[PDB]
C-alpha cells in the first residue's frame, strides 16, 4: 500500500464495501419484475419487500418477507429492471 | 490490618455516643 489510489477504486473494490462506506453511497437493492405462473399480469416488486405481495385480482401470493431479500414462491420468475 | 483498626475506631464512636449525649 502507502500509495493506494483513493480517487479511482476498481469496481471489484467498491462492490465489496459497505454501502455507506463507498466513495459515493449506493443501495444494494433493486426493483424486480415478477410474473405469476397462472396469471398474466406483470408486477413490480421490491427486492427487500416487507409486505406479502399478491396479485390484485388473480389472488396469488407473489412473495413472502424474510430477514433479507423477500422470498419468491415457486413457479414465479423475475428479472431486474434496468 | 486496616480493617481491624476501622472496626476498633467504630466501637469507640459507638461508646462515645452513650458517654457524650445531649443530656450531659
Amino acid at each position: 500500500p502507502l500509495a493506494k489510489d483513493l480517487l479511482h477504486p476498481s469496481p471489484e473494490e467498491e462492490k465489496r464495501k459497505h454501502k455507506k462506506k463507498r466513495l459515493v453511497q449506493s443501495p444494494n437493492s433493486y426493483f424486480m419484475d415478477v410474473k405469476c405462473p397462472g396469471c398474466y399480469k406483470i408486477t413490480t416488486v421490491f427486492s427487500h419487500a416487507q409486505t406479502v405481495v399478491l396479485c390484485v385480482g388473480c389472488s396469488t401470493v407473489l412473495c413472502q418477507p424474510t430477514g433479507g431479500k423477500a422470498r419468491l414462491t415457486e413457479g414465479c420468475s423475475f428479472r431486474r429492471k434496468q | 490490618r486496616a480493617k481491624w483498626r476501622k472496626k476498633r475506631m467504630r466501637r469507640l464512636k459507638r461508646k462515645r455516643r452513650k458517654m457524650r449525649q445531649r443530656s450531659k
Binding site: 459497505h18 454501502k19 455507506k20 459515493v24 453511497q25 449506493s26 443501495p27 426493483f31 408486477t43 413490480t44 416488486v45 421490491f46 419487500a49 416487507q50 409486505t51 405481495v53 429492471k81 434496468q82 | -
Partner: protein
Amino acid sequence: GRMHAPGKGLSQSALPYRRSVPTWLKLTSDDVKEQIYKLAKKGLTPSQIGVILRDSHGVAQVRFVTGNKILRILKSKGLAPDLPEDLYHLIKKAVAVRKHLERNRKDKDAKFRLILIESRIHRLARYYKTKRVLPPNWKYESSTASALV
C-alpha cells in the same frame, strides 16, 4: 450511538445519487397522490404508506415523484392526525408497559424501561412544543395517557 442503549449499530438506508424517477415507472404525480389519499383512509401512517407503495407500486420515493412529502400531502388534504406518529407510538408503548406493571409489582426492570420511555416522550414533546405543533399547555399525564391513545 443509541440514545438509551449502549449499542452503536450502523444499519440504515442509502439513497441513490439519482434523484430522478426511472423511465419504467409511468405513474403520474396526481395518480401517486390518489393512492396516498386512498391508503390514508384505511388508518395507515405515512411510514406505512411509504412501505406499501415501495413494495407494491414501484414507488421508491414520493419526494422524487410528486416533489412533496407524504405528511405534507396528507396535511394539505386534511388527513393528518392530531398527534405526530412518532409521539403517538411512544405513548402507546408507555401505556402497554404501565398496564403490565399493575399485575407485576416485582418487575423491577419494566420500571426502568418505563422511565426511559417517558424520558423519550418528554424529549419529543419539548421538541414539538418549540415547533408550535403541540399547544404550549400540552403535558403528558401518566394516568390520562390512554385518552391520547
